[PDB]
Structures are given as structure tokens and as C-alpha cells.
Amino acid sequence: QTVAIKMGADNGMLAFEPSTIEIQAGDTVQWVNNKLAPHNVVVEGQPELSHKDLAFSPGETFEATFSEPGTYTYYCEPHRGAGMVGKIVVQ
Numbered sequence: 001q002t003v004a005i006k007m008g009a010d011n012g013m014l015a016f017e018p019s020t021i022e023i024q025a026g027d028t029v030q031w032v033n034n035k036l037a038p039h040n041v042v043v044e045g046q047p048e049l050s051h052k053d054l055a056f057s058p059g060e061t062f063e064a065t066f067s068e069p070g071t072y073t074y075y076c077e078p079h080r081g082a083g084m085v086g087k088i089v090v091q
């Protein structure tokens with residue numbers, strides 16, 4: 001299935017929302033540029049699931065399919081210092 005994660009929280013925080021999500025192996029995650037762009041997504045240790053190019057416009061989306069179970073930490077480069085870091089748990 002496909003699950004969505006907002007980049008920039010609805011309340012104005014520099015965060016992914018939800019900041020932690022659990023999915024099943026084979027599921028696709030779609031990140032959607034929400035507020036306080038630009039943002040990107042670097043998945044630690046996983047260059048193939050990462051999207052280093054910045055997203056500037058609201059609604060811009062990009063996806064990654066997680067085929068291996070495990071816990072993945074990811075972050076937004078420009079806002080990493082502000083705590084914009086997320087976690088994906090693949091069951």
C-alpha cells in the first residue's frame with residue numbers, strides 16, 4: 001500500500017508528520033511537501049531510497065518503496081539542525 005508523510009507539520013513545526021510510522025515490507029512511502037519548504041529526504045545508509053534534490057513547491061511528492069524489514073532513520077538536510085528527522089519501521 002502507499003502511505004503519506006507530510007514534510008513540514010500542519011502546526012508550523014519543522015518536522016515530518018507523522019514523525020514515526022510503521023509499514024509492511026513492500027509498501028511505498030510518499031513524502032508530500034507541506035509547509036516551510038524547501039525539504040529533502042536522506043535515508044541513513046540507503047542512497048537508493050533517498051531523494052537529495054530539494055522540493056520547493058507545496059504538494060510536490062516523491063516516493064520510495066521499502067522492501068527490507070528493519071528500522072530506518074531519515075532526515076531533511078537543511079532542517080536537520082532543527083530536529084527534522086523521522087523514523088520508518090518496516091514490519
Ligand SMILES: [Cu+2]
Pocket residue numbers: 014038039040076077078079084
Ligand atoms: Cu526540511
